[PDB]
């Protein structure tokens, strides 16, 4: 059952936002070096497959350089039941987009704390103002929560508006989407890249974005940019089917 957490998440009362109800985001992964250091996020989309950002793998083209942590809440004191799995193969998106697939050495064990997120239908366009969630262990820029999994509820901004001069001035492609509060203060940041942007649809969470880049973090009029997952579903499915 993809997209359905067992520990229901909570809204807030990653820069800003709040600490996540522990294990309320069971698809969240921590992408780490062979040495145990968190540097990027990821999303479990199937027991053997993690979706992250291509730029997170810029340092090494070697699957051995990476490990995936599943089911955690703490970044340092990993809980005992935490699943730590090596990566066997890396798949960079073939058109140089900032998205990539990780095939794990062993299929993650599905538990109340480790659950895959659902994928959207091809070419779905998250509507303007849709409130979605981003999560990760990234920088907090003095906002509390360092070391614990944080979340933020952000409104999507349609590309036509996001590309205006007042915002990102034509930098955003159709294969990306924008999200964030234009007054600033709450945003994903370095360390959250490759992590999920999920939207609640009917009764479950759908992976709609991959945290990619931005002009800084939580700055006014500077929403974050995310890879538009719906434009890569067909490629993702082909990779999982043929590998």
Residues that bind ligand I5Y (CB under 6 A): 55, 98, 171, 187-190, 192-193, 211-217, 224
Comparing CB distances to ligand I5Y, the nearer of 48 and 187 is 187
| Residue nearest ligand I5Y, Cβ-based | 224
Minimum CB separation of residue 241 from ligand I5Y in Å reads 27
* Residue with the two structure tokens 């969240």: 28
Minimum CB separation of residue 122 from ligand I5Y in Å reads 23
Query: Are the beta carbons of 192 and 136 closer than 8 angstroms?
Result: yes
Minimum CB separation of residue 163 from ligand I5Y in Å reads 10
Q: Taking phi first (over 0 means left), then psi (-120 to 50 degrees means alpha), and beta for anything else, what does residue 160 get?
A: alpha
Comparing CB distances to ligand I5Y, the nearer of 1 and 131 is 131
Minimum CB separation of residue 228 from ligand I5Y in Å reads 14
Residue 99's closest CA among 234, 241, 219, 243?
234
Comparing CB distances to ligand I5Y, the nearer of 140 and 211 is 211
Q: List the beta bridge partners of residue 151.
A: 18, 135
List all residues 6 or more positions away from 95 whose beta carbon is below 8 Å from its beta carbon: none
Comparing CB distances to ligand I5Y, the nearer of 50 and 57 is 57
Comparing CB distances to ligand I5Y, the nearer of 80 and 142 is 142
Minimum CB separation of residue 7 from ligand I5Y in Å reads 25
Q: Which residues in the chain belong to E strands, given as ranges?
A: 18-19, 28-33, 38-46, 49-52, 66-70, 83-92, 100-104, 131-136, 150-157, 176-179, 196-201, 204-213, 224-228
């Amino acid at each position: 059952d993809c997209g359905k957490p067992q520990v229901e998440p909570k809204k807030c009362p990653v820069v800003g936002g709040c600490v996540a109800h522990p294990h309320s985001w069971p698809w969240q992964v921590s992408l780490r070096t062979r040495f145990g250091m968190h540097f990027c996020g990821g999303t479990l989309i199937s027991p053997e497959w993690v979706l992250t950002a291509a730029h997170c793998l810029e340092k090494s083209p070697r699957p051995s350089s990476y490990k995936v942590i599943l089911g955690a809440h703490q970044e340092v004191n990993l809980e005992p039941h935490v699943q730590e799995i090596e990566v066997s193969r890396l798949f960079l998106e073939p058109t140089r987009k900032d998205i990539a697939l990780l095939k794990l050495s062993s299929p993650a064990v599905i538990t109340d704390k480790v659950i895959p997120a659902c994928l959207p239908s091809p070419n779905y366009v998250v509507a303007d103002r849709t409130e979605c969630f981003i999560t990760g262990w990234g920088e907090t820029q003095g906002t509390f929560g360092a070391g614990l999994l944080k979340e933020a509820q952000l409104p999507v901004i349609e590309n036509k508006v996001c590309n205006r001069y007042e915002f990102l001035n034509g930098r955003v492609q159709s294969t990306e989407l924008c999200a964030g509060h234009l007054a600033g203060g709450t945003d994903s940041c370095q360390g959250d890249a490759g992590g999920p942007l999920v939207c609640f649809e009917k009764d479950k969470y759908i992976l709609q974005g991959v945290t990619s880049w931005g002009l800084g973090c939580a700055r006014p009029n500077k929403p974050g940019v995310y890879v538009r997952v719906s434009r890569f579903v067909t490629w993702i499915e082909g990779v999982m089917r043929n590998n």
